[PDB]
């Protein structure tokens, strides 16, 4: 059979303070189309169904921001995928360099995330 009622699925969502799109899990259906989202950094907010993306392994050739363990932040384009023991990775071509970043280290600018709401949106 199919997966359960959103609550438990790994997805990507818009942080509600008119921000960008960050990876997380649905924790609960808040109501009326809002679902509570635990972002992978440990944060939680309510997000409307349109603003949550559940068929979103970050598409290659899409533009994204990338973050390093030494705290650096810049933007580039997905051009590969990796799996490591139980987690997911993305090769980002950033400043002309194909560099491996984490699921949660690859963050979607709001205008990128819009192009995904249409196809991947819960709403």
């Amino acid at each position: 059979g199919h997966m359960n009622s959103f609550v438990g699925l790994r997805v990507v969502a818009k942080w509600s303070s008119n921000g960008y799109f960050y990876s997380g899990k649905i924790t609960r259906d808040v109501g009326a189309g809002k679902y509570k989202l635990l972002f992978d950094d440990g944060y939680e907010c309510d997000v409307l169904g349109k603003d949550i993306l559940l068929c979103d392994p970050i598409p290659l050739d899409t533009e994204v921001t990338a973050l390093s363990e030494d705290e650096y932040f810049s933007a580039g384009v997905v051009k590969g995928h990796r799996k490591e023991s139980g987690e997911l990775y993305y090769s980002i071509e950033k400043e002309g360099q194909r560099k491996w970043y984490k699921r949660m280290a690859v963050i979607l600018s709001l205008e990128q995330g819009n192009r995904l709401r249409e196809q991947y949106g819960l709403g």
């Binding site: 942080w15 303070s17 921000g19 960008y20 950094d41 440990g42 944060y43 921001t65 973050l67 963050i107």
Partner: peptide, 12 residues
């Protein structure tokens, strides 16, 4: 000072 974007300048 810091080196990170909008919200992800979290405690770690």
């Amino acid at each position: 000072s810091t080196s990170r974007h909008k919200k992800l300048m979290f405690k770690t």
